[PDB]
């Protein structure tokens, strides 16, 4: 949920609507919602980070567990 | 409010009156006093950071919600 | 002390009990409780940061004097 | 002063004794104290940043006035 995103520092680089560092959470939801295994995909990206999907700036790996990454993916996709 | 600003780590770089890494809060309050869109303007600056208004060193973006950014903006603008 | 910790920005990444970006203070206290040289060890880590103890995310170095690092270490150790 | 250094965020990368990001202040004092124009030289580096003198990691420019840069240099040199 949003409280968890805040607790894990996600909002430093992601706003719900504005572009900061990574994509707006509302934009991620638009891209992936309804797509097969969107939750599992996004959970992996949240924990491990990555580059090249939204731009050339990498997202670093994050101090989140698998269960946390899944909760955050579920929350994001619900926007 | 002040405790929120301290909790978020804003005082690592800002003081009420002293010039640290970023501008004093009182100096931000003075600069934007009376501007109709000061809260919304500063809220965005608090969320996103920025450069070039006060100096050449950029402020990093901040781990805040829209509601928190609004509260911090309102608090800052209240400083005499 | 807690207020120093907040002022320096430590609470941006650490909570007393919750697991944020860095380990909870209570968990640090538990791990190093009764270890001699705990204070000197944690002071070093507060000044210099590091990684690999709690996760693969590095803690950045911190804007603290050696005296402040030792104060913050002693406060963290007391969280039990 | 050590108080102005902390106030300006300098201690995040510099310790008096230990190596963090930039050189320990005690080591900078050893290299420059008693050299011609050491205050002006260091003040310029403090305000404008630089790289290659102590290693390959650049120091960024700093939000300090000229007076603050010269006071910081004088303090460092006294160590
Ligand atoms: C900067 C230091 C970041 C932090 C902290 C977090 N994120 Fe991130 N994120 C960032 C960038 C630059 C990008 C785009 C990477 C790219 O491939 O272009 C992202 C991306 C995401 C995504 C979408 C990934 C995808 O493959 O589509 C998600 C779902 C995401 N980020 C979530 C997220 C969470 C939950 C975070 C806190 C644990 C988090 N990010 C932190 C930059 C940064
Ligand atoms: C350094 C690591 C900072 C932290 C942490 C915070 N701020 Fe900041 N801030 C910093 C600088 C170097 C600047 C000047 C940027 C520039 O344009 O020259 C700022 C600026 C602000 C402002 C003024 C914005 C403007 O006038 O356009 C505000 C209102 C502000 N900062 C607030 C703020 C808050 C609430 C913070 C914690 C959530 C915060 N800052 C952290 C450096 C740093
Ligand atoms: C994120 C930008 C952080 C800030 C700001 C602070 N800390 Fe931190 N800390 C962070 C991480 C990611 C970790 C884990 C590092 C690892 O080894 O995996 C830590 C760790 C600590 C520790 C424990 C060190 C150890 O057991 O070896 C302590 C005692 C600690 N942090 C204290 C501390 C203080 C006092 C801070 C303000 C000066 C501070 N931290 C800021 C992330 C971040
Ligand atoms: C990292 C984000 C830094 C901050 C903040 C400050 N300094 Fe720095 N400094 C840093 C590095 C990596 C280096 C070495 C650069 C190189 O050429 O190898 C330095 C260097 C200095 C020096 C010596 C300069 C020289 O010998 O040419 C001084 C005197 C110095 N730094 C002082 C200083 C002050 C006063 C700061 C706060 C205003 C400050 N530094 C911040 C990294 C970083």
Short mmCIF file of C-alpha atoms and ligand atoms in Angstrom, two decimals:
data_model
loop_
_atom_site.label_atom_id
_atom_site.label_comp_id
_atom_site.label_asym_id
_atom_site.label_seq_id
_atom_site.Cartn_x
_atom_site.Cartn_y
_atom_site.Cartn_z
CA UNK A 1 0.00 0.00 0.00
CA UNK A 2 0.95 3.71 -0.04
CA UNK A 3 2.04 3.68 3.63
CA UNK A 4 4.44 0.79 2.69
CA UNK A 5 5.78 2.69 -0.38
CA UNK A 6 6.47 5.65 1.86
CA UNK A 7 8.01 3.44 4.55
CA UNK A 8 10.40 1.88 1.94
CA UNK A 9 11.46 5.19 0.40
CA UNK A 10 9.71 4.68 -2.93
CA UNK A 11 8.23 8.17 -3.02
CA UNK A 12 11.75 9.72 -3.23
CA UNK A 13 11.74 8.64 -6.89
CA UNK A 14 8.04 8.00 -7.68
CA UNK A 15 5.05 10.30 -7.37
CA UNK A 16 1.45 9.04 -7.98
CA UNK A 17 1.06 11.47 -10.91
CA UNK A 18 4.17 13.56 -11.43
CA UNK A 19 7.43 12.55 -13.09
CA UNK A 20 10.29 12.66 -10.58
CA UNK A 21 12.94 9.95 -11.24
CA UNK A 22 10.98 6.81 -12.09
CA UNK A 23 7.56 6.78 -13.77
CA UNK A 24 4.42 8.08 -11.97
CA UNK A 25 2.66 5.18 -10.28
CA UNK A 26 -0.51 6.04 -12.27
CA UNK A 27 1.52 5.52 -15.47
CA UNK A 28 2.86 2.11 -14.38
CA UNK A 29 -0.75 1.03 -13.62
CA UNK A 30 -1.83 2.14 -17.12
CA UNK A 31 0.99 0.19 -18.78
CA UNK A 32 0.57 -3.16 -17.02
CA UNK A 33 -2.91 -3.54 -15.50
CA UNK A 34 -4.77 -6.53 -16.92
CA UNK A 35 -1.56 -7.98 -18.35
CA UNK A 36 -0.67 -11.62 -17.60
CA UNK A 37 1.49 -11.95 -14.50
CA UNK A 38 1.72 -8.14 -14.08
CA UNK A 39 1.98 -8.50 -10.28
CA UNK A 40 4.85 -11.03 -10.41
CA UNK A 41 6.69 -9.08 -13.12
CA UNK A 42 6.48 -5.79 -11.24
CA UNK A 43 7.35 -7.43 -7.91
CA UNK A 44 10.64 -8.69 -9.43
CA UNK A 45 11.43 -5.20 -10.80
CA UNK A 46 10.64 -3.57 -7.50
CA UNK A 47 13.05 -5.82 -5.58
CA UNK A 48 15.86 -6.15 -8.15
CA UNK A 49 15.52 -2.74 -9.94
CA UNK A 50 16.23 -2.38 -13.66
CA UNK A 51 16.74 0.02 -16.55
CA UNK A 52 15.58 0.78 -20.09
CA UNK A 53 11.80 0.28 -19.79
CA UNK A 54 10.78 3.87 -19.12
CA UNK A 55 14.11 5.57 -19.95
CA UNK A 56 17.86 5.18 -19.43
CA UNK A 57 18.06 5.94 -15.69
CA UNK A 58 18.29 2.72 -13.66
CA UNK A 59 16.22 1.88 -10.65
CA UNK A 60 18.59 0.43 -8.00
CA UNK A 61 17.80 -2.78 -6.09
CA UNK A 62 15.60 -2.13 -3.02
CA UNK A 63 15.59 -3.32 0.62
CA UNK A 64 12.20 -5.08 0.21
CA UNK A 65 11.18 -8.72 0.75
CA UNK A 66 9.30 -10.78 -1.91
CA UNK A 67 6.00 -10.25 0.03
CA UNK A 68 6.63 -6.52 0.26
CA UNK A 69 7.42 -6.33 -3.48
CA UNK A 70 4.14 -8.13 -4.24
CA UNK A 71 2.12 -5.81 -1.95
CA UNK A 72 3.66 -2.77 -3.62
CA UNK A 73 2.99 -4.20 -7.10
CA UNK A 74 -0.64 -4.93 -6.13
CA UNK A 75 -1.02 -1.39 -4.77
CA UNK A 76 0.55 0.25 -7.83
CA UNK A 77 -1.63 -1.71 -10.27
CA UNK A 78 -4.76 -0.56 -8.39
CA UNK A 79 -4.13 3.09 -9.34
CA UNK B 1 4.77 21.14 10.53
CA UNK B 2 8.23 21.33 12.15
CA UNK B 3 8.24 17.76 13.52
CA UNK B 4 7.25 16.41 10.07
CA UNK B 5 10.07 18.37 8.45
CA UNK B 6 12.56 17.00 11.03
CA UNK B 7 11.26 13.41 10.63
CA UNK B 8 11.55 13.51 6.79
CA UNK B 9 15.16 14.68 7.15
CA UNK B 10 14.61 18.23 5.84
CA UNK B 11 16.78 19.71 8.63
CA UNK B 12 19.83 17.80 7.32
CA UNK B 13 20.03 20.65 4.76
CA UNK B 14 17.72 23.44 6.05
CA UNK B 15 17.52 25.55 9.20
CA UNK B 16 14.86 28.08 10.23
CA UNK B 17 17.31 30.99 10.09
CA UNK B 18 20.81 29.75 9.12
CA UNK B 19 21.95 29.14 5.52
CA UNK B 20 23.01 25.47 5.43
CA UNK B 21 22.97 23.46 2.19
CA UNK B 22 19.55 24.84 1.24
CA UNK B 23 17.94 28.24 1.96
CA UNK B 24 16.72 29.08 5.49
CA UNK B 25 13.00 28.33 5.90
CA UNK B 26 12.43 31.92 6.97
CA UNK B 27 14.07 33.09 3.74
CA UNK B 28 11.75 30.87 1.63
CA UNK B 29 8.78 32.30 3.58
CA UNK B 30 9.95 35.88 2.81
CA UNK B 31 10.63 35.19 -0.90
CA UNK B 32 7.14 33.76 -1.54
CA UNK B 33 5.08 35.87 0.90
CA UNK B 34 1.77 36.88 -0.65
CA UNK B 35 2.07 34.76 -3.82
CA UNK B 36 -1.31 33.18 -4.55
CA UNK B 37 0.17 29.84 -5.69
CA UNK B 38 2.99 29.56 -3.10
CA UNK B 39 1.66 26.39 -1.42
CA UNK B 40 1.18 24.45 -4.67
CA UNK B 41 4.48 25.79 -6.03
CA UNK B 42 6.50 24.82 -2.94
CA UNK B 43 4.72 21.50 -2.53
CA UNK B 44 5.96 20.55 -6.06
CA UNK B 45 9.49 21.77 -5.24
CA UNK B 46 9.47 19.73 -1.99
CA UNK B 47 8.31 16.58 -3.89
CA UNK B 48 10.50 16.97 -6.98
CA UNK B 49 13.46 19.04 -5.78
CA UNK B 50 15.13 21.43 -8.21
CA UNK B 51 18.04 23.76 -8.90
CA UNK B 52 18.98 27.37 -9.71
CA UNK B 53 16.52 29.34 -7.55
CA UNK B 54 18.87 29.79 -4.58
CA UNK B 55 22.09 28.33 -5.91
CA UNK B 56 23.63 25.80 -8.25
CA UNK B 57 23.36 22.76 -5.93
CA UNK B 58 20.22 20.74 -6.67
CA UNK B 59 17.78 19.72 -3.99
CA UNK B 60 17.06 15.97 -4.38
CA UNK B 61 13.44 14.76 -4.77
CA UNK B 62 11.80 13.84 -1.43
CA UNK B 63 10.05 10.84 0.06
CA UNK B 64 6.75 12.65 0.68
CA UNK B 65 3.12 12.25 -0.31
CA UNK B 66 1.20 15.14 -1.90
CA UNK B 67 -0.54 15.76 1.46
CA UNK B 68 2.78 15.86 3.31
CA UNK B 69 4.34 18.20 0.75
CA UNK B 70 1.35 20.53 1.11
CA UNK B 71 1.65 20.51 4.92
CA UNK B 72 5.41 21.26 4.75
CA UNK B 73 4.83 24.07 2.25
CA UNK B 74 2.12 25.60 4.48
CA UNK B 75 4.40 25.32 7.54
CA UNK B 76 7.38 26.92 5.76
CA UNK B 77 5.28 29.84 4.47
CA UNK B 78 4.13 30.42 8.08
CA UNK B 79 7.73 31.15 9.34
CA UNK B 80 8.46 34.76 10.34
CA UNK C 1 19.76 11.02 21.04
CA UNK C 2 16.38 10.80 19.26
CA UNK C 3 16.12 14.49 18.48
CA UNK C 4 19.66 14.60 17.03
CA UNK C 5 18.84 11.52 14.98
CA UNK C 6 15.75 13.25 13.55
CA UNK C 7 17.64 16.50 12.92
CA UNK C 8 20.41 14.67 10.96
CA UNK C 9 17.82 12.90 8.84
CA UNK C 10 18.35 9.37 10.22
CA UNK C 11 14.57 8.83 10.50
CA UNK C 12 14.22 9.24 6.73
CA UNK C 13 15.57 5.67 6.56
CA UNK C 14 15.28 4.28 10.11
CA UNK C 15 12.45 3.77 12.57
CA UNK C 16 12.63 2.68 16.23
CA UNK C 17 10.51 -0.41 15.45
CA UNK C 18 9.45 -0.48 11.78
CA UNK C 19 11.76 -1.76 9.08
CA UNK C 20 12.23 1.09 6.63
CA UNK C 21 15.23 1.49 4.26
CA UNK C 22 17.68 0.67 7.09
CA UNK C 23 17.21 -1.70 10.08
CA UNK C 24 14.95 -0.72 12.97
CA UNK C 25 16.89 0.85 15.88
CA UNK C 26 15.48 -1.74 18.30
CA UNK C 27 16.93 -4.45 16.01
CA UNK C 28 20.35 -2.77 15.93
CA UNK C 29 20.27 -2.53 19.74
CA UNK C 30 19.35 -6.23 19.96
CA UNK C 31 22.16 -7.32 17.61
CA UNK C 32 24.90 -5.38 19.39
CA UNK C 33 23.62 -5.55 23.00
CA UNK C 34 26.45 -6.52 25.29
CA UNK C 35 29.12 -6.56 22.58
CA UNK C 36 32.08 -4.71 23.80
CA UNK C 37 33.23 -2.00 21.46
CA UNK C 38 29.59 -1.74 20.28
CA UNK C 39 29.73 2.07 20.62
CA UNK C 40 32.97 2.46 18.63
CA UNK C 41 31.75 0.03 16.00
CA UNK C 42 28.37 1.73 15.46
CA UNK C 43 29.92 5.21 15.55
CA UNK C 44 32.17 4.18 12.62
CA UNK C 45 29.15 2.85 10.69
CA UNK C 46 27.09 6.01 11.38
CA UNK C 47 29.93 8.25 10.05
CA UNK C 48 30.96 6.10 7.13
CA UNK C 49 27.88 4.09 6.28
CA UNK C 50 28.32 0.66 4.69
CA UNK C 51 26.46 -2.42 3.47
CA UNK C 52 26.15 -6.22 3.73
CA UNK C 53 25.16 -6.39 7.40
CA UNK C 54 21.35 -6.14 6.97
CA UNK C 55 20.92 -6.03 3.17
CA UNK C 56 22.71 -5.18 -0.06
CA UNK C 57 21.58 -1.49 0.01
CA UNK C 58 24.44 0.81 1.21
CA UNK C 59 23.93 3.34 3.91
CA UNK C 60 25.56 6.61 2.72
CA UNK C 61 28.14 8.38 4.90
CA UNK C 62 26.61 10.94 7.26
CA UNK C 63 27.18 14.60 8.12
CA UNK C 64 28.25 13.92 11.68
CA UNK C 65 31.23 14.76 13.87
CA UNK C 66 32.83 11.90 15.78
CA UNK C 67 31.14 13.16 18.98
CA UNK C 68 27.73 13.13 17.25
CA UNK C 69 28.35 9.60 15.91
CA UNK C 70 29.13 8.36 19.40
CA UNK C 71 26.01 10.08 20.84
CA UNK C 72 23.87 8.48 18.16
CA UNK C 73 25.45 5.03 18.76
CA UNK C 74 24.84 5.25 22.49
CA UNK C 75 21.19 6.30 21.94
CA UNK C 76 20.63 3.45 19.42
CA UNK C 77 22.07 0.88 21.90
CA UNK C 78 19.63 2.09 24.58
CA UNK C 79 16.61 1.03 22.49
CA UNK C 80 15.92 -2.21 24.45
CA UNK D 1 35.33 26.18 11.71
CA UNK D 2 34.22 22.60 12.39
CA UNK D 3 30.76 24.05 13.11
CA UNK D 4 30.61 25.82 9.67
CA UNK D 5 31.86 22.64 7.97
CA UNK D 6 29.02 20.62 9.55
CA UNK D 7 26.56 23.39 8.80
CA UNK D 8 27.55 23.17 5.10
CA UNK D 9 27.22 19.36 4.85
CA UNK D 10 30.99 18.83 4.45
CA UNK D 11 31.25 16.09 7.07
CA UNK D 12 29.08 13.78 4.91
CA UNK D 13 32.18 13.25 2.73
CA UNK D 14 35.03 14.33 5.01
CA UNK D 15 36.08 13.18 8.44
CA UNK D 16 38.84 14.86 10.49
CA UNK D 17 40.83 11.58 10.53
CA UNK D 18 39.04 8.77 8.66
CA UNK D 19 38.68 8.31 4.91
CA UNK D 20 35.04 8.56 3.85
CA UNK D 21 34.52 10.05 0.37
CA UNK D 22 37.07 12.89 0.15
CA UNK D 23 40.43 13.11 2.07
CA UNK D 24 40.45 13.40 5.84
CA UNK D 25 40.84 17.06 6.83
CA UNK D 26 44.08 16.16 8.73
CA UNK D 27 45.56 14.85 5.47
CA UNK D 28 44.59 17.95 3.49
CA UNK D 29 46.32 20.05 6.24
CA UNK D 30 49.50 17.88 5.88
CA UNK D 31 49.63 18.35 2.06
CA UNK D 32 49.05 22.12 1.96
CA UNK D 33 49.95 23.86 5.22
CA UNK D 34 52.79 26.32 4.68
CA UNK D 35 52.49 26.30 0.88
CA UNK D 36 52.13 29.53 -1.10
CA UNK D 37 48.49 30.53 -1.77
CA UNK D 38 47.12 27.50 0.10
CA UNK D 39 44.07 29.43 1.40
CA UNK D 40 43.09 30.71 -2.09
CA UNK D 41 43.79 27.31 -3.67
CA UNK D 42 41.64 25.32 -1.21
CA UNK D 43 38.88 27.96 -1.10
CA UNK D 44 38.54 27.61 -4.88
CA UNK D 45 38.27 23.83 -4.60
CA UNK D 46 35.76 24.02 -1.72
CA UNK D 47 33.40 26.31 -3.66
CA UNK D 48 33.88 24.83 -7.17
CA UNK D 49 34.70 21.16 -6.43
CA UNK D 50 37.19 19.11 -8.40
CA UNK D 51 38.69 15.70 -9.08
CA UNK D 52 41.99 13.84 -9.60
CA UNK D 53 44.08 15.24 -6.75
CA UNK D 54 43.24 12.60 -4.12
CA UNK D 55 41.78 9.93 -6.42
CA UNK D 56 39.20 9.63 -9.18
CA UNK D 57 35.99 10.51 -7.28
CA UNK D 58 34.97 14.11 -8.00
CA UNK D 59 33.98 16.60 -5.30
CA UNK D 60 30.78 18.50 -6.47
CA UNK D 61 30.46 22.31 -6.27
CA UNK D 62 29.29 23.51 -2.85
CA UNK D 63 26.69 26.06 -1.69
CA UNK D 64 29.26 28.29 0.06
CA UNK D 65 30.14 31.98 -0.29
CA UNK D 66 33.73 33.08 -1.05
CA UNK D 67 34.14 34.16 2.59
CA UNK D 68 32.86 30.78 3.78
CA UNK D 69 35.21 28.94 1.41
CA UNK D 70 38.22 30.91 2.70
CA UNK D 71 37.18 30.41 6.36
CA UNK D 72 36.81 26.67 5.72
CA UNK D 73 40.25 26.55 4.03
CA UNK D 74 41.87 28.48 6.91
CA UNK D 75 40.23 26.09 9.43
CA UNK D 76 41.33 22.94 7.50
CA UNK D 77 44.91 24.28 7.24
CA UNK D 78 45.04 24.81 11.03
CA UNK D 79 44.41 21.12 11.81
C1 LIG E 1 15.45 5.96 -7.47
C2 LIG E 1 16.71 5.89 -6.59
C3 LIG E 1 14.30 4.96 -7.26
C4 LIG E 1 13.81 4.42 -6.14
C5 LIG E 1 14.25 4.67 -4.67
C6 LIG E 1 12.68 3.60 -6.51
N1 LIG E 1 12.53 3.64 -7.88
FE1 LIG E 1 11.22 2.47 -9.00
N2 LIG E 1 12.02 3.18 -10.74
C7 LIG E 1 13.05 4.13 -10.80
C8 LIG E 1 13.41 4.33 -12.19
C9 LIG E 1 14.48 5.30 -12.68
C10 LIG E 1 12.48 3.43 -12.97
C11 LIG E 1 12.42 3.21 -14.48
C12 LIG E 1 13.41 2.07 -14.77
C13 LIG E 1 13.33 1.75 -16.25
O1 LIG E 1 13.35 0.55 -16.63
O2 LIG E 1 13.25 2.70 -17.08
C14 LIG E 1 11.67 2.73 -12.01
C15 LIG E 1 10.69 1.81 -12.31
C16 LIG E 1 9.77 1.26 -11.43
C17 LIG E 1 8.63 0.43 -11.77
C18 LIG E 1 8.22 0.00 -13.20
C19 LIG E 1 9.25 -1.02 -13.67
C20 LIG E 1 8.91 -1.65 -15.03
O3 LIG E 1 9.61 -2.61 -15.43
O4 LIG E 1 7.96 -1.22 -15.72
C21 LIG E 1 8.01 0.12 -10.62
C22 LIG E 1 6.74 -0.74 -10.45
C23 LIG E 1 8.73 0.76 -9.54
N3 LIG E 1 9.79 1.42 -10.06
C24 LIG E 1 8.42 0.71 -8.21
C25 LIG E 1 9.20 1.14 -7.16
C26 LIG E 1 8.99 0.80 -5.78
C27 LIG E 1 7.76 0.01 -5.24
C28 LIG E 1 9.96 1.39 -5.08
C29 LIG E 1 10.19 1.35 -3.55
C30 LIG E 1 10.60 -0.08 -3.01
C31 LIG E 1 10.83 2.07 -6.00
N4 LIG E 1 10.34 1.87 -7.27
C32 LIG E 1 11.91 2.85 -5.64
C33 LIG E 1 13.66 4.76 -9.73
C34 LIG E 1 13.49 4.46 -8.39
C1 LIG E 2 19.91 18.46 0.74
C2 LIG E 2 20.35 16.97 0.74
C3 LIG E 2 18.42 18.82 0.99
C4 LIG E 2 17.43 18.18 1.63
C5 LIG E 2 17.48 16.79 2.35
C6 LIG E 2 16.25 19.01 1.53
N1 LIG E 2 16.56 20.17 0.80
FE1 LIG E 2 15.20 21.60 0.29
N2 LIG E 2 16.72 22.46 -0.75
C7 LIG E 2 18.05 22.08 -0.85
C8 LIG E 2 18.76 22.93 -1.76
C9 LIG E 2 20.27 22.79 -2.13
C10 LIG E 2 17.72 23.91 -2.24
C11 LIG E 2 17.94 25.08 -3.23
C12 LIG E 2 17.56 24.59 -4.64
C13 LIG E 2 17.68 25.77 -5.58
O1 LIG E 2 16.72 26.01 -6.32
O2 LIG E 2 18.72 26.50 -5.54
C14 LIG E 2 16.48 23.56 -1.57
C15 LIG E 2 15.28 24.24 -1.72
C16 LIG E 2 14.12 24.08 -1.02
C17 LIG E 2 12.96 24.95 -1.05
C18 LIG E 2 12.81 26.22 -1.91
C19 LIG E 2 12.36 25.84 -3.34
C20 LIG E 2 12.23 27.05 -4.24
O3 LIG E 2 12.35 28.22 -3.75
O4 LIG E 2 11.99 26.87 -5.46
C21 LIG E 2 12.05 24.43 -0.21
C22 LIG E 2 10.64 24.94 0.15
C23 LIG E 2 12.62 23.25 0.39
N3 LIG E 2 13.88 23.05 -0.11
C24 LIG E 2 11.99 22.44 1.31
C25 LIG E 2 12.52 21.23 1.72
C26 LIG E 2 11.81 20.23 2.45
C27 LIG E 2 10.37 20.43 3.04
C28 LIG E 2 12.64 19.21 2.66
C29 LIG E 2 12.36 17.88 3.43
C30 LIG E 2 11.11 17.09 2.92
C31 LIG E 2 13.89 19.51 2.01
N4 LIG E 2 13.77 20.77 1.44
C32 LIG E 2 15.01 18.71 2.04
C33 LIG E 2 18.63 21.01 -0.23
C34 LIG E 2 17.89 20.07 0.47
C1 LIG E 3 19.35 5.97 3.88
C2 LIG E 3 19.57 7.08 2.81
C3 LIG E 3 19.94 6.06 5.31
C4 LIG E 3 20.15 7.13 6.12
C5 LIG E 3 19.83 8.61 5.81
C6 LIG E 3 20.69 6.63 7.36
N1 LIG E 3 20.81 5.22 7.28
FE1 LIG E 3 21.61 4.03 8.66
N2 LIG E 3 21.37 2.37 7.32
C7 LIG E 3 20.79 2.46 6.07
C8 LIG E 3 20.89 1.15 5.42
C9 LIG E 3 20.36 0.80 4.03
C10 LIG E 3 21.57 0.26 6.46
C11 LIG E 3 21.96 -1.23 6.38
C12 LIG E 3 23.40 -1.30 5.92
C13 LIG E 3 23.78 -2.76 5.83
O1 LIG E 3 24.84 -3.06 6.39
O2 LIG E 3 23.02 -3.56 5.21
C14 LIG E 3 21.86 1.11 7.60
C15 LIG E 3 22.49 0.72 8.77
C16 LIG E 3 22.62 1.47 9.94
C17 LIG E 3 23.14 0.99 11.20
C18 LIG E 3 23.61 -0.46 11.49
C19 LIG E 3 25.04 -0.67 10.99
C20 LIG E 3 25.56 -2.08 11.31
O3 LIG E 3 24.88 -2.91 11.97
O4 LIG E 3 26.69 -2.37 10.88
C21 LIG E 3 23.12 1.99 12.09
C22 LIG E 3 23.59 1.94 13.57
C23 LIG E 3 22.62 3.17 11.41
N3 LIG E 3 22.32 2.83 10.09
C24 LIG E 3 22.44 4.42 11.99
C25 LIG E 3 22.15 5.58 11.31
C26 LIG E 3 22.23 6.94 11.81
C27 LIG E 3 22.56 7.27 13.28
C28 LIG E 3 21.82 7.78 10.83
C29 LIG E 3 21.73 9.34 10.85
C30 LIG E 3 23.14 9.96 11.11
C31 LIG E 3 21.54 6.96 9.66
N4 LIG E 3 21.75 5.66 10.03
C32 LIG E 3 21.06 7.40 8.44
C33 LIG E 3 20.26 3.58 5.52
C34 LIG E 3 20.34 4.86 6.03
C1 LIG E 4 31.07 14.55 -1.60
C2 LIG E 4 29.58 14.65 -2.01
C3 LIG E 4 31.78 15.79 -0.97
C4 LIG E 4 31.28 16.85 -0.28
C5 LIG E 4 29.82 17.14 0.14
C6 LIG E 4 32.39 17.70 0.08
N1 LIG E 4 33.56 17.15 -0.42
FE1 LIG E 4 35.43 17.98 -0.40
N2 LIG E 4 36.20 16.43 -1.59
C7 LIG E 4 35.43 15.36 -1.99
C8 LIG E 4 36.29 14.48 -2.78
C9 LIG E 4 35.91 13.14 -3.47
C10 LIG E 4 37.63 15.18 -2.86
C11 LIG E 4 38.90 14.71 -3.61
C12 LIG E 4 38.85 15.42 -4.97
C13 LIG E 4 40.11 15.12 -5.71
O1 LIG E 4 40.64 16.04 -6.37
O2 LIG E 4 40.57 13.95 -5.62
C14 LIG E 4 37.49 16.40 -2.09
C15 LIG E 4 38.49 17.33 -1.89
C16 LIG E 4 38.44 18.35 -0.97
C17 LIG E 4 39.53 19.18 -0.57
C18 LIG E 4 40.98 19.07 -1.09
C19 LIG E 4 41.05 19.72 -2.49
C20 LIG E 4 42.40 19.58 -3.16
O3 LIG E 4 43.36 19.11 -2.52
O4 LIG E 4 42.53 19.97 -4.36
C21 LIG E 4 39.05 20.04 0.36
C22 LIG E 4 39.81 21.15 1.10
C23 LIG E 4 37.64 19.80 0.55
N3 LIG E 4 37.30 18.75 -0.25
C24 LIG E 4 36.81 20.49 1.45
C25 LIG E 4 35.43 20.42 1.51
C26 LIG E 4 34.51 21.37 2.15
C27 LIG E 4 35.05 22.57 3.00
C28 LIG E 4 33.25 20.91 1.98
C29 LIG E 4 31.88 21.50 2.44
C30 LIG E 4 31.67 22.95 1.87
C31 LIG E 4 33.34 19.72 1.16
N4 LIG E 4 34.65 19.49 0.91
C32 LIG E 4 32.29 18.89 0.78
C33 LIG E 4 34.11 15.11 -1.68
C34 LIG E 4 33.22 15.97 -1.04
#
